Amino acid sequence: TPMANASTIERKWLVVDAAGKTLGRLSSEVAAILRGKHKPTYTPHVDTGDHVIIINAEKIELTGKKLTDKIYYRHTQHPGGLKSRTALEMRTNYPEKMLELAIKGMLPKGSLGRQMFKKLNVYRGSEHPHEAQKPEVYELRG
Amino acid sequence: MKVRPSVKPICEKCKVIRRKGKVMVICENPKHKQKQG
Amino acid sequence: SRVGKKLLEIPSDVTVTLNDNNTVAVKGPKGELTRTFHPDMEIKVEDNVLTVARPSDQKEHRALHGTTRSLLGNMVEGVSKGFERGLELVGVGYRASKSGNKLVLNVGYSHPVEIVPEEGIEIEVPSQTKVVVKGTDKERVGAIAANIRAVRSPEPYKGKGIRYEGEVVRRKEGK
Amino acid sequence: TKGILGRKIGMTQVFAENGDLIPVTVIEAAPNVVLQKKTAENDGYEAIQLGFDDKREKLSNKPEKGHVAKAETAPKRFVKELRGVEMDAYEVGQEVKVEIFSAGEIVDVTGVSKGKGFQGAIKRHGQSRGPMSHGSRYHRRPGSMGPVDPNRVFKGKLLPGRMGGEQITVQNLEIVKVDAERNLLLIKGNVPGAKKSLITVKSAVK
RNA sequence: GGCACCUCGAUGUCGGCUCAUCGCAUCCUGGGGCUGUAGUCGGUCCCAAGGGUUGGGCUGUUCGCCCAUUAAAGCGGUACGCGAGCUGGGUUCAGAACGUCGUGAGACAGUUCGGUCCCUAUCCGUCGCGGGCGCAGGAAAUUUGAGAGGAGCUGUCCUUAG
RNA sequence: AUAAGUGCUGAAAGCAUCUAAGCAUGAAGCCCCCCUCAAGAUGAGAUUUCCCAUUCCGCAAGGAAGUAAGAUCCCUGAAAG
Numbered sequence A: 001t002p003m004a005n006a007s008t009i010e011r012k013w014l015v016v017d018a019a020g021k022t023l024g025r026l027s028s029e030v031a032a033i034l035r036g037k038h039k040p041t042y043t044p045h046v047d048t049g050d051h052v053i054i055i056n057a058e059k060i061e062l063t064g065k066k067l068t069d070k071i072y073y074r075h076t077q078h079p080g081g082l083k084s085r086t087a088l089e090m091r092t093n094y095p096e097k098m099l100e101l102a103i104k105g106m107l108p109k110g111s112l113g114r115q116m117f118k119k120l121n122v123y124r125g126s127e128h129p130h131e132a133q134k135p136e137v138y139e140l141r142g
Numbered sequence B: 001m002k003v004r005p006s007v008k009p010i011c012e013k014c015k016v017i018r019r020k021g022k023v024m025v026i027c028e029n030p031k032h033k034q035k036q037g
Numbered sequence C: 001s002r003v004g005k006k007l008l009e010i011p012s013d014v015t016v017t018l019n020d021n022n023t024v025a026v027k028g029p030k031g032e033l034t035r036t037f038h039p040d041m042e043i044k045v046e047d048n049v050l051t052v053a054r055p056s057d058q059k060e061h062r063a064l065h066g067t068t069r070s071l072l073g074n075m076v077e078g079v080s081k082g083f084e085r086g087l088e089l090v091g092v093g094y095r096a097s098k099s100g101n102k103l104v105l106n107v108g109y110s111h112p113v114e115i116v117p118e119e120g121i122e123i124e125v126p127s128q129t130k131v132v133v134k135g136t137d138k139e140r141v142g143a144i145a146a147n148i149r150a151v152r153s154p155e156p157y158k159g160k161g162i163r164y165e166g167e168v169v170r171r172k173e174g175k
Numbered sequence D: 001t002k003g004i005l006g007r008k009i010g011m012t013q014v015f016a017e018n019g020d021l022i023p024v025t026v027i028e029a030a031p032n033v034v035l036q037k038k039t040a041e042n043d044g045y046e047a048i049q050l051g052f053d054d055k056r057e058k059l060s061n062k063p064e065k066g067h068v069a070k071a072e073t074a075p076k077r078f079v080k081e082l083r084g085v086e087m088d089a090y091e092v093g094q095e096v097k098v099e100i101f102s103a104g105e106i107v108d109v110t111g112v113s114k115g116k117g118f119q120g121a122i123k124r125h126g127q128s129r130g131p132m133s134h135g136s137r138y139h140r141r142p143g144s145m146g147p148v149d150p151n152r153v154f155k156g157k158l159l160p161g162r163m164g165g166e167q168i169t170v171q172n173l174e175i176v177k178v179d180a181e182r183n184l185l186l187i188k189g190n191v192p193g194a195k196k197s198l199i200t201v202k203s204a205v206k
Numbered sequence E: 001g002g003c004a005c006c007u008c009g010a011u012g013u014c015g016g017c018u019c020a021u022c023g024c025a026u027c028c029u030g031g032g033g034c035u036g037u038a039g040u041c042g043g044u045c046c047c048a049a050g051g052g053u054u055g056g057g058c059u060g061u062u063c064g065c066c067c068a069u070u071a072a073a074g075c076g077g078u079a080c081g082c083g084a085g086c087u088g089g090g091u092u093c094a095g096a097a098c099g100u101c102g103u104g105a106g107a108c109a110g111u112u113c114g115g116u117c118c119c120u121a122u123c124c125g126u127c128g129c130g131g132g133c134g135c136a137g138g139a140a141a142u143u144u145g146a147g148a149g150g151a152g153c154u155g156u157c158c159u160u161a162g
Numbered sequence F: 001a002u003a004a005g006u007g008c009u010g011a012a013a014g015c016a017u018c019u020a021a022g023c024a025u026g027a028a029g030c031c032c033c034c035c036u037c038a039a040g041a042u043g044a045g046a047u048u049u050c051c052c053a054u055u056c057c058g059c060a061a062g063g064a065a066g067u068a069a070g071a072u073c074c075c076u077g078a079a080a081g
């Protein structure tokens, strides 16, 4: 009979600056943090995660020829309605959706996985409204 | 061009240059202009 | 048997000034040229000499060891003297002129061809046939010279259109 | 990018300095007033509101009366908005008259088209029917819903439904004549909508 | 075509009509390289699926030939797309006849004439239209646009200029 | 912004080369511009304006019961259905 903690969950606000990293190795340590996999009071069904803020999304970088070759495909529900954007077309236009799509993938699926996606808010540049909450400046492990 | 999967020099003045990932034959004679594909 | 192993000597009219990280600025009587290089190649200043050195012996270090130095040398040459490309054009009623800065080629088309050398490039038209592109960068003089040659590449039957100095234009006998 | 909004009356027929007939729409625009001059500094985009009609007191509400009586004219029936206008010239409370347009220039016209109701695939989507004879029980019908392999119908199989009532723009229409004292535009051609209906006459996106 | 894996307590089978969508191995249009490409026209090849891609004669016909256009009259997927959407000419029921086979009753990827195309949509899915609640007060209007659909074709004539 | 293609500079590889760096053109195609829908965009947004923060309970949280601006039932109808 271990602890199965529910509504005893204090949530931390973190700042992860994305100004040089690869998005696969940033978002894998971010999407694991958004569920509270680093928190020892982890129960798999009550969202023990914390809040994550990503700042300077437009400077997150890639390896190899991924800027021109990694293609974000997005079909509509209409015939002939597959749309494509490259990684640079996502990068220079809006890096926030590109980062949020990585984290939507790497967060688990279901009602609570969408609830844990609700915790994260990716921004372009260093505007970051969110001063009302003490967001600590967070460094990633690798 | 000559887009053919067996690109090779024809005369003595043909040159085999791997341009941008594709092996081409570039010559002074423009019929010997080749590229694999 | 290597470009990058030799020296490049800088007697006069060329002052090479390392100013920022890899940004080499070279000043002189014609004009000044700035070029930012890759941070692996190292460039040392002997008294009026540039010396170029590579860290290792690798596929990319040999290439940069050629190109950084060769571009430095052409910066020195274009600061000392500058560059120019000659542009012969042959035809029946085929002609060039200039209005102010703008080159007006009335060559074969039913419209005028109006070329604007925006970055500061001196185009001579010494006579109604020739067009000379003159400036400081090979990368810019040769660029706008190819821009002029792209207006009309030469036909192989009658050599028409724009044409370089000693360009051996291929001849076909269309009968 | 100049524009007004008015109301449709009908079609007339006008000779133009020659024997040439021109089909004409008459649009009656009693002069509009800038009601709210939206700016970029808070709203993120530079547009402007215009109001067109004179409601009674009884028909209008206190939020309408307040929003209008910021610039005191009368509560108005049709408020719409023009994007990207010359915002140095317009000010809040300005009678935007019909004196703007002349007979020369090109004009884009947007109006809400006539409603047709629940109609079939042939009057709505212009499809063709099957034969009325040779034994056929097929006519006036929308077609095969699709192939079998997707186990469903694709999105966009055009079917019966309500036709009409969308906002619709006819582009590059031409003005014949302006009657500023009767507050009338005369426009060459056909303009979408029923009679007594509001139609906004912009300048053309040429 | 091989094999017989699903279906014989039923998976309607050709052609056409309606409605399309998709692939590119591109028929036209767009951009090109090579030429044994002078020019106009061409041949081949490369990139490109955005749009367009005709109306008749005979035939059940797909196909094919022909007529006359076109810028072009592209090939193939979707149960050789689409019969709880339609037709039923052909196949493939019972009548009958011909040729031929069989002693015979009868048989023929031989021909010919005639022959019942059932179903009030529960769910998904489409196309439209409402009602609830949400949107941390309750309201009336004007909106930004994430996103989504549409549109995207092309001839000839004059001038440059014989 | 590109695809095919065409190039400059230009090495690796004293040269040559559209090359690894650096640069530039270039299609009815891609993204827009054009037309429509569109905040249920649960990420539910944004403006302008109206109403105001009452009455009882109960020891509180909260409940109910008049309302305000506003809307609706019902009625006259068509440009809508």
Ligand SMILES: CC[C@H]1OC(=O)[C@@H](C)C(=O)[C@H](C)[C@@H](O[C@@H]2O[C@H](C)C[C@H](N(C)C)[C@H]2O)[C@](C)(OC)C[C@@H](C)C(=O)[C@H](C)[C@H]2N(CCCCn3cnc(-c4cccnc4)c3)C(=O)O[C@]12C
Residues within 6 Å of the ligand: E010, E012, E116, E117, E118
């Ligand atoms: C009127 C519609 C008839 O359908 C069809 O016959 C026909 C249109 C079909 O296509 C139908 C759907 C068939 O199904 C097909 O069967 C095939 C063998 C196979 C097919 N798939 C499985 C592939 C399947 O679709 C089938 C087998 O019917 C034969 C269905 C089967 C259950 C029946 O037989 C069925 C009961 C028929 N039937 C039998 C009497 C028929 C004689 N009759 C005619 N007219 C009268 C009549 C008139 C007026 C008054 N009284 C009587 C009487 C009826 O009275 O009505 C029927 C439903």
